Every structure is written in structure tokens, then in C-alpha cells.
Amino acid sequence: GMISNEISKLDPLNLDAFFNQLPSLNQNLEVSLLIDKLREITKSYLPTTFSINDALAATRDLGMIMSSVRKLGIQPVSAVSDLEVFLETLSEITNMVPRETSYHYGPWNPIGERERRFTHFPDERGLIEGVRIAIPGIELAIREINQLSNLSLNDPAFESLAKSAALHVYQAVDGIGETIKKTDPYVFSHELRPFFDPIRIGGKSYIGAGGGQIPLFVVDVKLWLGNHSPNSEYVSFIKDSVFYLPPELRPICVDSLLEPSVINQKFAEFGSVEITDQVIKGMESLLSVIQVLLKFRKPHFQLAQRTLSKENRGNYTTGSAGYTNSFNHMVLEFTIEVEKQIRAVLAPY
Ligand code: HEM
Ligand SMILES: N[C@@H](Cc1c[nH]c2c(Cl)cccc12)C(=O)O
């Protein structure tokens, strides 16, 4: 478990003053100052001496300087070739990618004066608050949904855990609503999106931080996807994402991809045991969770559609992971289909 407060409060590379300048440096395209800071960092710090929390915060801070350079069109590790050993040492300690993710940008990013930010645009706050709210709640919902596999539908503990998970997933809904109300789609495409492009590090390419990196897909795999669609595009996105996750989430995701999902296994229990009143309540509680997922994916799809429109898309047709809104349409159709299947099983009652 990575406690966010213990990471957000760190400044292991003494960059707090620099991050008050960074929005202005990025505005004036001052690539010399960005590159000079990367060079100073590799000479000023023995990263092998860092604790885990220090290395996570360093990844957060160094990652944002790197993404700023990449935003100008320069591969930062090709320009500062000593970065590669530095980043490699850091990722040995974190056992995470040598690059920042949504985790670094949201929950590990401090609130207030020290908040790390690429730009001066307040639309940026919409992305930061979006993932900073979404991630902790989704993580609690993962712990709770994981316990459902080992409870009976007829146990009120089942229904109560699923309800808790639905409440915690609502944090993803609150997160995307913060984005819808603060982030203008046109300012996103033209001012924010360019900071989330891929960076070549040790001969492979790491996508930038993205909303898709909140572990919502982990909820999906345990809850409905399981091992049921082996060749889908969504299982390929998840495949590519497992090792971007914090280590503690990786076994949950891997085992869930290799097992039947909760809803599939609870469908079997339902149509084979004595269907009582607690059992309907328990099955009703799984549909509640799914319906919360839709309360996220429906407005998310609209937001992505206004942003990728001809008028609004700027220079991009994809998200940071290389997909169009078609991918969102497919994840959301998958979820609508589970809601239909659950409502079918319940219709007699
Ligand atoms: C202007 C704002 C946004 C746009 C244009 C946008 C668009 C997209 C796009 C194009 C994808 C496809 C995957 C990829 O290529 O990376 C995607 C995936 C995803 N994004 Fe966003 N997004 C926005 C804001 C957010 C926010 C704030 C969050 C979370 C708080 C979020 C969460 C997700 C998730 C969870 C996925 C994976 C698909 C799913 O589970 O439905 N997005 N988004
Ligand atoms: N969710 C979209 C747009 C996006 C890029 N970076 C983000 C961040 Cl860092 C937070 C929230 C959303 C986004 C994507 O995954 O590329």
C-alpha cells in the first residue's frame, strides 16, 4: 500500500521553487531551462540512496519536467543521455515504469501551493482533481469487490459489500464531473493533451499519464470481464496497462484476467440455489455497482466526443494510450450489455 500523504508531501529533488516557475517556462518555450534542470538533477542526486516514497515522488517530479520537454518535440532521454541510468535506478526502487502516471499527477500530487502543474490554465485543475478523486475510491472498491467472490448471495454481508463498492465507485463519477465543469474541451486539446505524449526510455516507449490509468479496468476485470473475451481490444488495453499499475494492484488484475468474473459466477449461483429475498437484494447490489460504472462512462464518452470533434481536437485524434472514442464506445457497450444481462436474470422477480 502506497499512502498518498506520505508521497505528496515529499520534495526529494528540491524542485518546489522550480514548479512555481514551470507554467511560465512552458508558456515561453524555455527548453534550455528545462534541459538544464534535467542535467542538474542527474549530477546533484544519488538516486540509489532514495527510499521508496522518495523515488515515487522523484518519478512524479522528474516525469513532469520530462513531459514538458517532450511536449516541445524533443525526446528528453536522447537530449540528456545520463537520464537513462538515473531513471533506471529509480524504477528499480519503485518497480514502476520510469515515467509518471495518473497516480503521480493526482493522488501523489500535493494540494495547494505545491501542486505540480504543467500550465497556468485552470482547465488543468479539472484533470488533476479528476484523477485525484477517482483513484482512491476505485482502489477501495477493488478491495471490496474482491471479497464478493467468497460470499453467498444469501449473505447480507454480500449486499453490504457491493453497496460500499458502489459508493466508492461514485468517486469516479464525482471525479469526471469535476473535469466536465472545469476543463474546456478546446483548451484540453490545444494546451493540455500535448503534455501526455510518449517518451522513449531505454529503447522502449512509455505512454504519458492518462485517465485510463486509474485502475477502473481492474474493477471491470474482477466484476464482469473475467476471462470471457480472450481476444477483445479491451483485454489488449488491459494487458498493456498491468505493469503501469502500482505493484500491489498487479496480482489482483492478473488473477482476475485468468478466472471467471464475479457476475458470471454469481449468475450461476443464482440460477441454482434457493432464490430468497436476501438473494435478490444481493443480485440487485451487483447491478447497482454496474449502474454506477455507467454514470461514469456515459458522461465520459460525451466529454471525449466534444473534445475529439473536428472543431475541438487540435492536433490529435487519440488519447494518450493511442485510441479513439471508438474504444470508449466499446467499453461502454460492454457495460450496458452486463446491465441488460443482470436485468434479464431478475425480470421474473
Ligand atoms: C478532456 C478530458 C478527457 C478526454 C478528451 C478523454 C478521452 C479519453 C480517450 C480518448 C480515451 C481512450 C483511451 C486512450 O486513448 O488513452 C479515454 C480513456 C479513459 N479515460 Fe478519458 N478523457 C478525459 C478525461 C478523463 C478523466 C478526467 C478521467 C478520470 C478521472 C478519465 C478516465 C478514463 C478512463 C477510465 C478510460 C478507460 C476507458 C473506460 O474505462 O471507460 N478521462 N479517455
Ligand atoms: N483520459 C484521457 C485524457 C487524459 C490524458 N491525460 C489525463 C490525465 Cl493526466 C488525467 C485525466 C484525463 C487525462 C487519456 O487517457 O488520454
What DSSP string runs through 137-162?
HHHHHHHHHHHHTTS-TTSHHHHHHH
Q: Which residue has the cell 531551462?
A: 33
C-alpha cell at 192: 493540455
Q: How far is CA 49 from the centre of its chain?
A: 29
Q: Is residue 118 part of a domain?
A: no
Please state, in angstroms and rounded to a whole number, the distance separating the CA atoms of residues 251 and 248: 7
Q: Are residues 139 and 96 in the same domain?
A: no
Domain count within the chain: 2
Indicate whether residue 127 lines ligand 2 (CB < 6 A).
Answer: yes
Indicate whether residue 131 lines ligand 1 (CB < 6 A).
Answer: yes
Neighbours of 53 (CB within 10 A): 19
| Sign of the C-alpha dihedral computed for residues 298, 319, 330 and 104 taken in this order | negative
Q: 79: domain range?
A: 4-105
Question: Which of 73, 105, 137 finishes a domain?
Answer: 105
Question: Which of 52, 72, 105 finishes a domain?
Answer: 105
Smallest CA separation from ligand 1 atom 22, residue: 304
Is residue 123 within 8 A of residue 156, CB to CB? The reply is no
What are the φ/ψ torsions at residue 200 (nearest 5 degrees)? -85, 120
Indicate whether residue 105 lines ligand 2 (CB < 6 A).
Answer: yes
Please state, in angstroms and rounded to a whole number, the distance separating the CA atoms of residues 308 and 304: 6
CATH number of residue 326's parent domain: 1.20.58.480
Q: Are residues 255 and 140 in the same domain?
A: yes
Question: Which of 79, 105, 131 finishes a domain?
Answer: 105
Q: Are residues 202 and 289 in the same domain?
A: yes
Q: Is residue 112 part of a domain?
A: no
Please state, in angstroms and rounded to a whole number, the distance separating the CA atoms of residues 262 and 139: 17
Which residues, including other chains, have CB under 8 Å from residue 326's CB and lie 6 or more apart? none
Q: Is residue 117 part of a domain?
A: no
The strand pairing partners of 204, in sequence order, are 201
Q: Is residue 114 part of a domain?
A: no
* Number of separate helices (H) and strands (E) present in the chain: 16, 2
Q: Is residue 80 part of a domain?
A: yes
Please state, in angstroms and rounded to a whole number, the distance separating the CA atoms of residues 120 and 25: 10
Half-sphere exposure of residue 104, counting CA atoms within 13 Å on the CB side? Answer: 30
Q: How far is the CA of 300 from the centre of ligand 1 (A)?
A: 7
What are the φ/ψ torsions at residue 100 (nearest 5 degrees)? -80, 150
Q: Is residue 69 part of a domain?
A: yes
Q: Provide the phi-psi class of 202: left if phi over 0, else alpha when psi is between -120 and 50, else beta.
A: left
Indicate whether residue 194 lines ligand 1 (CB < 6 A).
Answer: no
Q: Are residues 296 and 324 in the same domain?
A: yes
Q: How far is the CA of 17 from the centre of ligand 2 (A)?
A: 26
CATH number of residue 32's parent domain: 1.20.58.1320
Q: Are residues 143 and 192 in the same domain?
A: yes
Q: Are residues 266 and 233 in the same domain?
A: yes
- Please give the method by which this entry was determined: X-ray
Which has the closest alpha carbon to 108: 227, 217, 224, 209?
209
Of the bound ligands, which one is closest to the alpha carbon of residue 307? Answer: 1
Q: Are residues 283 and 148 in the same domain?
A: yes
Q: Which residue has the cell 470508449?
A: 328
Q: How far is the CA of 123 from the centre of ligand 2 (A)?
A: 12
Is residue 69 within 8 A of residue 35, CB to CB? The reply is yes
Neighbours of 248 (CB within 10 A): 10
Is residue 30 within 8 A of residue 68, CB to CB? The reply is no
Q: Is residue 98 part of a domain?
A: yes
Q: Are residues 166 and 30 in the same domain?
A: no
Which has the closest alpha carbon to 12: 43, 36, 41?
41
Report resolution (Å) to 1 decimal: 2.4
Is residue 76 within 8 A of residue 66, CB to CB? The reply is yes
Q: Are residues 185 and 325 in the same domain?
A: yes
* The residue type at 11: D
What are the φ/ψ torsions at residue 315 (nearest 5 degrees)? -95, 5
Which has the closest alpha carbon to 212: 95, 130, 143?
130
Biggest alpha carbon–alpha carbon distance for the chain = 71
Which has the closest alpha carbon to 14: 53, 48, 61?
61
Q: Is residue 113 part of a domain?
A: no
Please state, in angstroms and rounded to a whole number, the distance separating the CA atoms of residues 169 and 172: 5
Which ligand 1 atom is at minimum distance from the Cα of 332?
Answer: 41
Is residue 40 within 8 A of residue 76, CB to CB? The reply is no
Q: Are residues 299 and 330 in the same domain?
A: yes
DSSP at 74: -
Q: Are residues 89 and 160 in the same domain?
A: no
Which ligand 2 atom is at minimum distance from the Cα of 130?
Answer: 11
Q: Are residues 179 and 130 in the same domain?
A: yes
Indicate whether residue 319 lines ligand 2 (CB < 6 A).
Answer: yes
